């Protein structure tokens, strides 16, 4: 819910710099002379930056040597039809690149197989200034590598079509992460109204990063493999590690945890990694079901939890929820709900992004202002 | 093991521990080049079906090059 607390940045500027360098007068000639021998080379541009240069398709070597010495030989009539297919190949990829860059306007956020084939991407990963661990990670998750890599069309001149494929680096690797799920916590008083609700707004991802915590509220930035959590720190907040305390002791003096106050008596279901949280309030139906044994639980009013072991379904109202069937040990930390610490007439009825300290300060203000009369 | 999860009934929140990381820190750029030649005004009959197909492909190639030049 903190999604609007992020700063803005540029996603492709690191490639636009290389393009502005490639637009120099004697730039493309250097790259062409370098690739005149092999398909890939290391090229020191005129700005000191060393880049990898891959020649994925050589049509001049095909046109001026095999096709045009047939069309322009003499007597245009070709004997065999094999030339038509040989030219449909080696040109389908250029046509597809043109068709892609026409509708995407220079930058395609997933690098397609036509921009960079899988074998070419694997070779590029193998020949990168990265460690063996990062090489293996990218080789095993080429799909996620494509998800976070742009392809900026750069230049076409001097018989050379150029585009810079800007890839993710994955500097932080194998530092343990954890996902924080949240659900509204409301009192279960018998009244139809005057029911208070507290929620945690720090939901998302958390990762160890240089002694601090990289926290991702926007779940789009993080893809998830079996146990690997790929993320993008361009849309990440940087917190002290003590924010993790907000899991074990929310009233700690170190980190002021972020919460949310509301007065909404609506039930909800939050599917977690290896289970499901159910905030069942009012007359809403809440049923944990199984594929074999029909129904296995009916949730009492409050915020409860079930593990994905044996549970195949959580249904709240008319809303169905298929639980994630991944193995893992769940634990139920028993403890009194926090919402039972405050009073209805003093609890702030409306504060979107609040905290323990801010809610306590508003409580102080209201209590003092009422008692001074 | 390697994936454990806790549910904190106190705050009505769950935490999924046991996940490793791969955080995008910066970027790496590499130049991918396609070398193209020119089919400069080849003149030849379009009566035969095979040569007509060849011309249908030559026009596609030339238009692709020109359109790449245009989109800039």
């Amino acid at each position: 819910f903190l999604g609007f607390l992020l700063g803005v940045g540029s996603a492709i500027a690191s490639g636009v710099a290389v393009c502005k360098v490639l637009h120099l007068e004697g730039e493309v000639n250097k790259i062409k002379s370098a690739l005149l021998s092999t398909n890939k080379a290391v090229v020191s541009l005129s700005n000191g930056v060393s880049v990898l240069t891959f020649k994925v398709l050589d049509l001049k070597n095909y046109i001026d040597k095999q096709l045009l010495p047939i069309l322009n030989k003499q007597s245009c009539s070709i004997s065999n039809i094999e030339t038509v297919i040989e030219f449909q190949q080696k040109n389908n990829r250029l046509l597809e690149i043109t068709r892609e860059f026409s509708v995407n306007a220079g930058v395609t956020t997933p690098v397609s197989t036509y921009m960079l084939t899988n074998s070419e991407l694997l070779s590029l990963i193998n020949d990168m200034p990265i460690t063996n661990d990062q090489k293996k990670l990218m080789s095993n998750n080429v799909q996620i590598v494509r998800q976070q890599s742009y392809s900026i069309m750069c230049i076409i001149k001097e018989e050379v079509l150029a585009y810079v494929v800007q890839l993710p680096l994955y500097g932080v690797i194998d530092t343990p992460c954890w996902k924080l799920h949240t659900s509204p916590l409301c009192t279960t008083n018998t009244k139809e109204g005057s029911n208070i609700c507290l929620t945690r707004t720090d939901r998302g991802w958390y990762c160890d990063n240089a002694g601090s915590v990289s926290f991702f509220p926007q779940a789009e930035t993080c893809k998830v493999q079996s146990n690997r959590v790929f993320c993008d720190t361009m849309n990440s907040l940087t917190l002290p590690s003590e924010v993790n305390l907000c899991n074990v002791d929310i009233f700690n003096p170190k980190y002021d945890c972020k919460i949310m106050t509301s007065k909404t008596d609506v039930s909800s279901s939050v599917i977690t990694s290896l289970g499901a949280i159910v905030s069942c309030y009012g007359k809403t139906k809440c049923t944990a079901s199984n594929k074999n044994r029909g129904i296995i639980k009916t949730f009492s009013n409050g915020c409860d939890y079930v593990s994905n072991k044996g549970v195949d379904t959580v249904s709240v109202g008319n809303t169905l929820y298929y639980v994630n069937k991944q193995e893992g040990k769940s634990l139920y930390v028993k403890g009194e709900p926090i919402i039972n610490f405050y009073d209805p007439l003093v609890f702030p009825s409306d504060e979107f992004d609040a905290s323990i300290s801010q809610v306590n300060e508003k409580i102080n203000q209201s209590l003092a202002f009422i008692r001074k009369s | 093991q390697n994936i454990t999860e806790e549910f904190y009934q106190s705050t009505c929140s769950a935490v999924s521990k046991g996940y490793l990381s791969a955080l995008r820190t910066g970027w790496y750029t590499s130049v991918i080049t396609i070398e193209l030649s020119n089919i400069k005004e080849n003149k030849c009959n379009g009566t035969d079906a095979k040569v007509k197909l060849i011309k249908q492909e030559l026009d596609k190639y030339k238009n692709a090059v020109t359109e790449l030049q245009l989109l800039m």
Partner: antibody
Amino acid sequence: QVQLVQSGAEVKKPGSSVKVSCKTSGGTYGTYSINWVRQAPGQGLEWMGAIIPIFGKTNYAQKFQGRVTITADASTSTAYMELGSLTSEDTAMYYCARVEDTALDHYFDYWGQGALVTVSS
Amino acid sequence: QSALTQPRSVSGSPGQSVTISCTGTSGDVGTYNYVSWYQQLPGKAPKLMIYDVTRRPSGVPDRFSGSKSGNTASLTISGLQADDEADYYCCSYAGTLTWVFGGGTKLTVLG
């Protein structure tokens, strides 16, 4: 078949300007660039400038910088050029040549018959 | 950005090979293998016979053979004929929409 017509010859006075047009009859809508080259009576041509009519992009030689402005009308597929502040040293046979594709070709393939600009008193 | 240096004149009797040199700076030639030679019959716009470092267009005799080595080009004509009478003009790509021209060689056969 594919060719380009060229304006007629004319005469000006030192200090005036001459505007020479160059219309093409080929088309193809490609990224062709029109190049201006006024030789002399004296031996040797001299490359002046260039313009890609599809973009309006121009680039002039350092010998005539700030003196010539090359233009091109895209509706009629015609490329003009205007050389102001003429001198008798700028008397030549102003030709007009193109290159097929700016990114694929780096040599002139077709020319025009050209005009003749004499500027005396 | 000055013009190129060509020999003012060469000549050869029929049945002889003549080579015309074209020298330029590091920017014009030596860097770009984009050279072009043009002939001009006085009274008409030029018409090229070499459209790359060593490539000739459609309708050019095999005796025409070009080359290039370190800021110096070489246009070679084999078996001279009474038809190859014109002013040859060496040209070279120099950058984005910038070409440099040679001083022109004047080839008129002796025979």
